[PDB]
Design a protein around this nucleic acid. Structure first.
Ligand SMILES: [Mg+2]
Length: 134
DNA sequence: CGCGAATCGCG
DNA sequence: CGCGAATCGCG
């Protein structure tokens, strides 16, 4: 399996798990940052990876782009394909924002179609995903 | 730590 | 029992 350079890659920057969550999507070839979500005060890394893929799908759909999305999160990929984020994070006032975003991203998936292939980034073969926060 | 995938205990 | 609830492998 080979890298598709004409693609978008996403990843999450965490400060703890659970902890602060941010994410971004970048051009796999050029590294150009295409979208970014500012820090969400608490979430899980998995929830962040899920939001990052869905944000990518919405971004690419708006632009009518047929580029695939790479994610290094097998869990988030499954959640998007299932249209269901199977997170165990407690729902309270502290976690209200991350859950609002996850709920909305699920709602988007259940009310839209998309052509974007969602591919697993193979870190062990290809090194770090381009959206890595380092 | 959170996930998906892969031994227990109660009815 | 045997099925549904309750450690492994990884990132
Ligand atoms: Mg990540």
């Amino acid at each position: 399996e080979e890298i598709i350079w004409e693609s978008l890659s996403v990843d999450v920057g965490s400060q703890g798990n659970p902890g602060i969550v941010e994410y971004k999507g970048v051009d796999t070839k050029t590294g150009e940052v295409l979208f970014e979500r500012e820090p969400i005060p608490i979430g899980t890394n998995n929830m962040g990876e899920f939001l990052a893929i869905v944000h990518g799908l919405r971004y690419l759909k708006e632009r009518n782009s047929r580029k695939p999305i790479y994610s290094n999160s097998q869990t988030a990929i499954k959640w998007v394909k299932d249209k269901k984020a199977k997170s165990t994070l407690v729902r309270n006032e502290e976690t209200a924002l991350i859950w609002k975003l996850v709920d909305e991203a699920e709602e988007w998936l259940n009310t839209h179609t998309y052509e974007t292939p969602i591919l697993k980034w193979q870190t062990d073969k290809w090194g770090e995903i381009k959206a890595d926060y380092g």
